[PDB]
Amino acid sequence: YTAAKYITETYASKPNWQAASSIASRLIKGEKAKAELRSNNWPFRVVGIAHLEKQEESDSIEWFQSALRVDPNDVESWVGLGQAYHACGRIEASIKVFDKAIQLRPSHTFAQYFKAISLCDVGEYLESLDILEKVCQEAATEESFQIGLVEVLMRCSLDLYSQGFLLKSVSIAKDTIERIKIIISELKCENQQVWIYLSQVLRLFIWIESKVDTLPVESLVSIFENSEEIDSVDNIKIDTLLDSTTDDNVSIACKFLILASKYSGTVRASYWYNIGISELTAFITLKEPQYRDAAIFAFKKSIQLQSNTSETWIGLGIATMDINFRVSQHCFIKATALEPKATNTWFNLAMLGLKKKDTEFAQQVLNKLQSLAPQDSSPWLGMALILEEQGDIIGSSKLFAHSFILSNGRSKAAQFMYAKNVLENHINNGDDERDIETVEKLTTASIALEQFFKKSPDSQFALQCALLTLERLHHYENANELANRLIGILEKKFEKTQDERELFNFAIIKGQFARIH
């Protein structure tokens, strides 16, 4: 025992845990240390810890539980048991264990950080944020605590975005960007995780475009000023960014999005895939060929790195939708073969088939997708579009309504098509204002358009539809602002090309604006 303890503590401080585990196991199994082992729990603790750095987490649970039964006051045994429970998908048990360990030793620091991570995993952002803020206040030198705080901030912002809290998501994104700027400026610590977090945060400003002017362009400059194959295509550089003119807010947002991907073979494949995804987002948002070329180049390199992931094939198929349909078809087939449980590839193939005006193939694939994922709102949208193209009107309306109900506000296209269909079905139908169903449909369409304008404003067709709906709903105060924005957009559009065909819509907009007054 005494000699065994000496050897164990000598090997534990090397550190070298395999030998310590072997010695503890041969001491326990010897059955000659009966009386001594009922007062101390160091051998079981060493065995559990050694299993813990071996990443065989489930094997150390029993050892930590035995060591805790022997001594219920071991804080490190509780911490090890909780960190083992977390890796086994036992998050609530780990939360309770971390609470117990904190209760024994309130000054313990890593326990609070682990508890905050677990609370974030189960979806308790307020308590975890408070814990991590207090921990970072107590000791700001630790890099892991700051990275964890940024991680929790980003996850909370994304969860709020998915839940429909679009106004606090941008505020939490700004807080995350400020924290990242603080980290890079003061700690001078760089890692791939923080740049991935920044890129995830930057998508919130592009997605919520009505709040894009709030982007902290001052902190981002210092973030990109305190740290070549693809540079010749996109030509996106910090110097070119600074010395630029006649550039819109959204374009600057997308160019900022494509700098964290370039400032960070599995790791290299992920790096190039991230750059390609950012460039694909920029190409979809701005519609310029050089972004498409850069995205294809990055996707090709990432495929040449691993070629065993579905997402790279989906991205390659998306980036080559118009240049060639056979290439997109092959990419989508390969992606589906790689991961058969993903329902997005079938929808992408359906959209590709619809873009080539092949209705039967799209109908067949959408029937299969509906059999596969009935709860998603995209197959219903595709079927509604197909039936609208064919000529059926009642079924198209029913499918649009079902898609809108299933979307639960998470789809812009569902809202737009539902509003357009409702307006089309009730524009010259000869109905009165005493019908509850029609007024409720108009109210739902107005609410859907209000939600739509928060993500993609300055859309002429949606603005006109909303103006008509608000005129029907007697909401003359919102229609004034909407018509002012529409008039401004039309004036800006017609003051650049210097055309004259826009005078026809100008008169109609002026007449509607006069009706609103």
Partner: peptide, 23 residues
């Protein structure tokens, strides 16, 4: 005054500015 309005009568950003100022 607007160019389109003038033509009709005859026939009858933030992020960039802040970026330049900061630099």
């Amino acid at each position: 005054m607007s160019l389109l309005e003038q033509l009709a009568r005859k026939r009858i950003v933030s992020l960039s500015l802040k970026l330049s100022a900061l630099k």
